[PDB]
Design a protein around this ligand. Sequence first.
Ligand SMILES: OC[C@H]1O[C@@](CO)(O[C@H]2O[C@H](CO)[C@@H](O)[C@H](O)[C@H]2O)[C@@H](O)[C@@H]1O
Ligand SMILES: OC[C@H]1O[C@@](CO)(O[C@H]2O[C@H](CO)[C@@H](O)[C@H](O)[C@H]2O)[C@@H](O)[C@@H]1O
Ligand SMILES: OC[C@H]1O[C@@](CO)(O[C@H]2O[C@H](CO)[C@@H](O)[C@H](O)[C@H]2O)[C@@H](O)[C@@H]1O
Ligand SMILES: O=N[O-]
Ligand SMILES: O=N[O-]
Ligand SMILES: O=N[O-]
Ligand SMILES: [Cu+2]
Ligand SMILES: [Cu+2]
Ligand SMILES: [Cu+2]
Ligand SMILES: [Cu+2]
Ligand SMILES: [Cu+2]
Ligand SMILES: [Cu+2]
Lengths: 334, 334, 334
Amino acid sequence: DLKLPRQKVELVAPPFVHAHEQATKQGPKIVEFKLTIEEKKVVIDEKGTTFQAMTFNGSMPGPLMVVHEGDYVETTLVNPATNTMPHNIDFHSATGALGGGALTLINPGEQVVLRWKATKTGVFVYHCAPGGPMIPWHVVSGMNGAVMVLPRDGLNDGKGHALKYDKVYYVGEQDMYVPRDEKGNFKSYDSPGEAFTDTEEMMKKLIPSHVVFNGKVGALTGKNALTANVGENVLIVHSQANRDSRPHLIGGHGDYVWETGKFGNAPEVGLETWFIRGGSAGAAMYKFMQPGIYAYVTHNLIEAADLGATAHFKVEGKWNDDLMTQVKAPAEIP
Amino acid sequence: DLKLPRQKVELVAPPFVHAHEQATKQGPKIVEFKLTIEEKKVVIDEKGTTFQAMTFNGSMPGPLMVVHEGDYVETTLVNPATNTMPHNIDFHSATGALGGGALTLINPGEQVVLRWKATKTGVFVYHCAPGGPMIPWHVVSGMNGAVMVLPRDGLNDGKGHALKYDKVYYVGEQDMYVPRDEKGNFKSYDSPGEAFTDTEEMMKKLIPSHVVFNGKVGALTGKNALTANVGENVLIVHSQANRDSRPHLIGGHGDYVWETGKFGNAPEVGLETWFIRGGSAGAAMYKFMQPGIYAYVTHNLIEAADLGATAHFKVEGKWNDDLMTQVKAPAEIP
Amino acid sequence: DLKLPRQKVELVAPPFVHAHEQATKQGPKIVEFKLTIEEKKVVIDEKGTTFQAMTFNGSMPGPLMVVHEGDYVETTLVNPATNTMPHNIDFHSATGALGGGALTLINPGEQVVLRWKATKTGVFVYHCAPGGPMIPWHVVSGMNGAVMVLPRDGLNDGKGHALKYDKVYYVGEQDMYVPRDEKGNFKSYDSPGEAFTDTEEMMKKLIPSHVVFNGKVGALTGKNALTANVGENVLIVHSQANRDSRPHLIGGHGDYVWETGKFGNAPEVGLETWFIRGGSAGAAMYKFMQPGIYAYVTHNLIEAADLGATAHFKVEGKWNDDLMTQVKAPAEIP
Ligand SMILES: OC[C@H]1O[C@@](CO)(O[C@H]2O[C@H](CO)[C@@H](O)[C@H](O)[C@H]2O)[C@@H](O)[C@@H]1O
Ligand SMILES: OC[C@H]1O[C@@](CO)(O[C@H]2O[C@H](CO)[C@@H](O)[C@H](O)[C@H]2O)[C@@H](O)[C@@H]1O
Ligand SMILES: OC[C@H]1O[C@@](CO)(O[C@H]2O[C@H](CO)[C@@H](O)[C@H](O)[C@H]2O)[C@@H](O)[C@@H]1O
Ligand SMILES: O=N[O-]
Ligand SMILES: O=N[O-]
Ligand SMILES: O=N[O-]
Ligand SMILES: [Cu+2]
Ligand SMILES: [Cu+2]
Ligand SMILES: [Cu+2]
Ligand SMILES: [Cu+2]
Ligand SMILES: [Cu+2]
Ligand SMILES: [Cu+2]
């Protein structure tokens, strides 16, 4: 029925985001994406703890999909025979059939093609949701990502002005539940199925062992720190499919923040810390003013420093002594 | 002193809501309600776990009371001699005397009549609050409900347009704390008083055993699923008197959401997931676009799927293939 | 370089706030503050539990600093040789160098002078953040306070009207993690260093033993209840540097609330309960209408009643029977 132009997107791994337009002169298109599910054992911390992950496209989070209002998003979801479990996909951006979940349940060896019309603007979670107790399990095993639906005129501040970002990053936060043995060491398992009983028991107690960005402690640091230059406006999309978070850029602010993540609402301005409700994505933009290292955290600092939820930015440019200066370096008290 | 017309309301059990006007040509009235407290042992899950509940009018949540701005709400609170504990009522909608709590403490065998002027619009929690450690205990035992204070002109979108709902449901969410024995089985108790010591010990650790809607796992499913038709605008009032929640309609959205619950503020639009602060009620309206089953959850999916916090909607009407379609059913990967 | 007038502030202990102007005709100044760090063992509850606290200026929270937009805040941070640990300060109001933390690390025996320009309006957390796992530890040991950056025209309602408070209080909420011995009694320690291992183990489990205002159970009660008169507009600044909170004034409302705490955004109106994201300060103003006792709580009522997070207001004036009246005192049921 649907006679619109087709455009393929090459997805890229988080925290990066596939190339896209903000404001566009294009009309509605059918935008084609492929997600291939991968179950895999991964390392989640610097001590070598392992984890039975379940992923879209091999990453935690799944990649960010970007379209415009009124596009049709046509996803080929692939569950190779090398996986063990059925899977599906639920888009919080979509209308009907449990977000798509009721139309996309696929066994290992199968694929399905779902299309949904992008009638709601904002950033939104997508996640697997097979049914029943498998829903939380697949999500907290890593099977969640996000999609961004931009207005065709790009972003605005609510107050008629365009808000154009120079770059965008996607920070997906994952609560993980790794059981411990009697000795107190984290357990390792041979399969997701073997991990399930212990993992569910822990899940129901509601306290994660790890809270990470991009799948692992320290993922968005060192070589893989986020970057910017003084003067650049950076959009940071943050999602959490199961559990609340409170993002904060240490040494910066949220200049324009959509904490509930939906562009039909004006952004709030000048925030210190914002709030991502579990089951949602939000977004914050900041124009960097100072060079140096920043930490981007959830501001439960226990989670940030001790459970894994810290990213860095390394920012280039000239220090601004008007905004901040060390008037007197550390010295002995007179 | 107060010479206004009197109107009696027949309360109805949640999730339903007693008949009322949205916009009205009536002026202020004294609106009369009766709440009769019932302490009772109830079943809270499909395994037969029992629970020492304390209720207004026999239900968890207590029933939704609906009035208009500037009405006077005159409540006869009754504590029959068949109960064991003192009780009272605190309305977050009311001004003075700890919300009414300091004027309504009644022993078994007593009743009291409190009137308060509805000067604040929105949805609001009411709950028992006897004093001290009994406050949390009575609340988490089930002694909470909500009241809705509508503008006399009905609801609006902030942007001069009326927002008229076709039906309203009240979802009261309850965190419950049922201790376990050494074997790991939930305990049963002969009285609320006998449950108290174990229950308080658990409460202070801040992790519920169950998180339910309408008093029990699965209460708002099967026969008792919520219903709608494609084209109907449904208001969903959600309250949580003690603990945060993050509502989400799976396959839908919050078209207009007052997550802090107060109609003096414009609604937010197009939300995926919203946030009910513990100690509050909020409200979301959605116009259904697709038939079929929806789940309405808190989007901590562990809580939703594993601890009890899932409702269903069954929606009648015609499927819209423009909004969503299964382009290719599950098939073997080529 | 900076040739502006200098003004010294004499800080005062919370919940009080040093004298300041709301609207002002002054231009930018360099506003001088001194904070002297004190590590000390304190009592945190009415049972005599002790706690290894780390403080700015001897108090939990640290004192509220008040300036205006475009002022420069020049803080002398002093770490006397009588302390054991290094410390620093991070202002969420400031731009660059991890909020100042990267420019203020001082060993016992040292002091440092940091200046930052107040370019963001609102209430903001400040806290110590030495590095790594020490960050959460110093914060949850008490090393956090707040700063308020007022517009030069004072506060407004977003809708061109001034919002002038008659008094302001600062409620700093502290999550505390005091381990228990095998017997189940809270442990005491001879030094912060000796407390660290047990305290970190508990911290990572994310459940506080105590949640207090102004450093101790019952701190803002009795002699030290907050006060008001009917007719007075009271601003209540609330901060939580590590963990969410949901403030509520029992028997009142938030007439004007900036829950995210930033004055570039209009306040919300008529709230029952608001939400302070961990890592932030927010503010609520209320004009008292009724005399008597109010409780100001976090509306996790377990936390409020059982873990320490209750303050009182004692309010003088004339009871308003229009707003609320006891129509019939407790009596036997007919
Ligand atoms: O930022 C969204 C917010 O801005 C307002 C204007 O106050 O509308 C702007 O954004 C809309 C969505 O992009 C545009 O359609 C509109 O033309 C533009 O003024 C609000 O209505 C909206 O909530
Ligand atoms: O939806 C509430 C929001 O709308 C505004 C207009 O932007 O006011 C509307 O609602 C008021 C409350 O019902 C009415 O009194 C008013 O006349 C109407 O325009 C905002 O002021 C308010 O925050
Ligand atoms: O309350 C802040 C809110 O109000 C608006 C008007 O709707 O702006 C007012 O506040 C600004 C900050 O103090 C002033 O600069 C402005 O002149 C005044 O109208 C909004 O723009 C703002 O979000
Ligand atoms: O801003 N520091 O946690
Ligand atoms: O929207 N699904 O959890
Ligand atoms: O408002 N009482 O918890
Ligand atoms: Cu899956
Ligand atoms: Cu979901
Ligand atoms: Cu009671
Ligand atoms: Cu209450
Ligand atoms: Cu310190
Ligand atoms: Cu911080």
